[PDB]
UniProtKB/Swiss-Prot annotation:
Changing K97E: Impairs SMP complex formation. The keyword Glycosyltransferase does not apply. This is Leucine-rich repeat protein SHOC-2. It comes from the Eukaryota.
Length: 499
C-alpha cells in the first residue's frame, strides 16, 4: 500500500536510473501523479491491481511505451493523448469498469494484443479495422451482441476469444481471418455459424459450448487443422455426413447435451485420431459396429445418459480405453467381451438395469474405479478377486445379500460403498482388505452381524452403519456407533493380540 509520496519516490527513482520498465502494480494507488510525464525512457508501464479510476493524459507523453498493463482497476475511459503511443504493442484492460472500448484505443494501430476480459462492453465499433495488426483479441465476459463485418479486416488474428457474451450470429467476413487458430465462442446465444467458417484452415480449437446451434455447416469439414471441437449444450441433432472424416487431426470432440439419436454417420475414419469423445446426455440408441476400429488412441469415452440397451459386438476391441462412462443407460447385461478392455482404469455403470455382471469383468487387471450404484445387482461374480488394482468399488442401492469370499483379494481397495443393499453378513475374507479406509454400510436393514476380521482393517477410518440392526452385537455397543463397534470387534474378537 503506497502513499502518493511513495509513488513519487518510485517515479523519481525510475527516471534517475533511466529504467525502461516501471512496475507500480499491487499498491492501492488512487491517482497517478502528473510527474510520470518525465519518464519518457519507459517501454513498459505496469499499473495493474490498483484503485485507479482515471489515467492521466500525461501517460500519452510516454512515447516509447510498448506495453501498458492496466488490469484490475476501475477505469471507465482512457485519455485521448494516448494517440501519441505510436509503438504501443500490448494493452491490458481486463477487470475494469468499461462500458465500451475507449475510442482512443481504436487509434492505437500498432497494437497486436488487446485484453478486455471482464468488463461491461456492449459494442465493438466499425473502427476495429484500424487495428489490423491485432493477433490476439480477447473480449470475453462482456456484453457484446454483435461483431461488425469490419472484423474480417484483422487478417493477422490468431486468437479471438468472445466467450461469455451475447452473440447471436457471426459476420460471414470472419472467414477472412484465415490465420485464426483459437476461436472461443462458448456461452453466447449463437443461432448458427457462417459458411465461410471453412476458410479458417488453421483453426485448431473451436469452442461453441452453451449456444443455440441447431446445425453445423458442412463447410466446417474444411477446418482440417481442428484438434478440439466442443459443441456441448446446443440443439444439434446431426452433423453433415463425414464431416469428422475430414478432420484428420481431431483428437477431442464433445457432443454432450445435444439432440443426437444416432452416432454421426461416416465410418471409422471419423475417430481415427480421436482421444477424448464426450457424447453424454443425448438419445443415442446404439454404438455402431466398427466406429472405433481405427481409433488407435481412443481412451476416454463418455456415453452417460443416452438410450443404450446393449453394447456392440466389437466392444472388447477398445484395447486402449482408460475411462468408460456408461451410466444412466438401460443396459441389462455387460457382454463377456468386456474382458478385452485391458487398459481400462475407470468403469462407470451406475443407474442401469444390471442384475449380474459377466465373468469377463475379472480380466480388467488395471481397473482402479468401478461404479455400479443404482443397479439391481443380486450377486458379484467370483472373478472380482482378479481386480487387483481396484481402489474404489461403489455398490450403493443394489440387491446384494452377501459378497463373494474372493473380495478379500482386493488388497488395493480403499473405498467400499455398500449402502442401501440387502446384506445379511460380510465374508470373513473382508479382513485381508489391507488398505480399506472407507466402508459404507448404512441402510442395510438385514445386516445383523459384522465379522470379527474387520478388526484386521488397520486403515479403516470411515464406516457408516446407520439403520443396520446388528442385533448379534450388544445393543449398547452398536448404539455407540462405529467407534464402539470397531473397538468391540478388535478387543473382544480373536485378533486382540495382533491389532
Ligand atoms: O477452461 C479451460 O480449461 C480452457 N478454456 C476452454 C476449455 C474448453 C472449452 O469449450 C468451449 O466451447 N470453450 C472452451 C474454453 C483454458 C483455461 C485457462 C487459460 C486458457 C484456456 O483456453 C483458451 C481457449 C480454449 C479454446 C478451446 C475450444 C474447444 C475445446 C478446447 C479448447 C478455444 C480458444 C481459446 Cl482462447
Ligand atoms: K441442449
Amino acid at each position: 500500500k503506497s502513499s502518493n509520496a511513495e509513488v513519487i519516490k518510485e517515479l523519481n527513482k525510475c527516471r534517475e536510473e533511466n529504467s525502461m520498465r516501471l512496475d507500480l502494480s499491487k499498491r492501492s494507488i488512487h491517482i497517478l501523479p502528473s510527474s510520470i510525464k518525465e519518464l519518457t525512457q519507459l517501454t513498459e508501464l505496469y499499473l495493474y491491481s490498483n484503485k485507479l479510476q482515471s489515467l492521466p493524459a500525461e501517460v500519452g507523453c510516454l512515447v516509447n511505451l510498448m506495453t501498458l498493463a492496466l488490469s484490475e482497476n476501475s477505469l471507465t475511459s482512457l485519455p485521448d493523448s494516448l494517440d501519441n503511443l505510436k509503438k504501443l504493442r500490448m494493452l491490458d484492460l481486463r477487470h475494469n469498469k468499461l462500458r465500451e472500448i475507449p475510442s482512443v484505443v481504436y487509434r492505437l494501430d500498432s497494437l497486436t494484443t488487446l485484453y478486455l476480459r471482464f468488463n461491461r462492453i456492449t459494442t465493438v465499433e466499425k473502427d476495429i479495422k484500424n487495428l489490423s495488426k491485432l493477433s490476439m483479441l480477447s473480449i470475453r465476459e462482456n456484453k457484446i451482441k454483435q461483431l461488425p463485418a469490419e472484423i474480417g479486416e484483422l487478417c493477422n488474428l490468431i486468437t479471438l476469444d468472445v466467450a461469455h457474451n451475447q452473440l447471436e450470429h457471426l459476420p460471414k467476413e470472419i472467414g477472412n481471418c484465415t490465420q485464426i487458430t483459437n476461436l472461443d465462442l462458448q456461452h453466447n446465444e449463437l443461432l448458427d455459424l457462417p459458411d465461410t467458417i471453412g476458410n479458417l484452415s488453421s483453426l485448431s480449437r473451436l469452442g461453441l459450448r452453451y449456444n443455440r446451434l441447431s446445425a453445423i455447416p458442412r463447410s466446417l469439414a474444411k477446418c482440417s487443422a481442428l484438434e478440439e471441437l466442443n459443441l456441448e449444450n446446443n440443439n444439434i441433432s446431426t452433423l453433415p455426413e463425414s464431416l469428422l472424416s475430414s478432420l484428420v487431426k481431431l483428437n477431442s470432440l464433445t457432443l454432450a447435451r445435444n439432440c443426437f439419436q444416432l452416432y454421426p454417420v461416416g465410418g471409422p475414419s471419423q475417430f481415427s485420431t480421436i482421444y477424448s469423445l464426450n457424447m453424454e446426455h443425448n438419445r443415442i440408441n446404439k454404438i455402431p459396429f466398427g466406429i472405433f476400429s481405427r481409433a488407435k488412441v481412443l481412451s476416454k469415452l463418455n456415453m452417460k445418459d443416452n438410450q443404450l440397451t446393449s453394447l456392440p459386438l466389437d466392444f472388447g476391441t477398445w484395447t486402449s480405453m482408460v475411462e468408460l462412462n456408461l451410466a444412466t443407460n438401460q443396459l441389462t447385461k455387460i457382454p463377456e467381451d468386456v474382458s478385452g478392455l485391458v487398459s481400462l482404469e475407470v468403469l462407470i455403470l451406475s443407474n442401469n438395469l444390471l442384475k449380474k455382471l459377466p465373468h469377463g469383468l475379472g480380466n480388467l487387471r488395471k481397473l482402479r474405479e468401478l461404479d455400479l450404484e443404482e443397479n439391481k445387482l443380486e450377486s458379484l461374480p467370483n472373478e472380482i478377486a482378479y481386480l487387483k488394482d481396484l481402489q474404489k468399488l461403489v455398490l450403493t442401492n443394489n440387491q446384494l445379500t452377501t459378497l463373494p469370499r474372493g473380495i478379500g483379494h482386493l488388497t488395493n481397495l480403499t473405498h467400499l460403498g455398500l449402502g442401501e443393499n440387502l446384506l445379511t453378513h460380510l465374508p470373513e475374507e473382508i479382513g485381508t482388505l489391507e488398505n480399506l479406509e472407507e466402508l459404507y454400510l448404512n441402510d442395510n436393514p438385514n445386516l445383523h452381524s459384522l465379522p470379527f476380521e474387520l478388526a484386521l482393517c488397520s486403515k479403516l477410518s470411515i464406516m457408516s452403519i446407520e439403520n443396520c440392526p446388528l442385533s448379534h452385537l450388544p445393543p449398547q455397543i452398536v448404539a455407540g456407533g462405529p467407534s464402539f463397534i470397531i473397538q468391540f470387534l478388535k478387543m473382544q474378537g480373536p485378533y486382540r493380540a495382533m491389532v
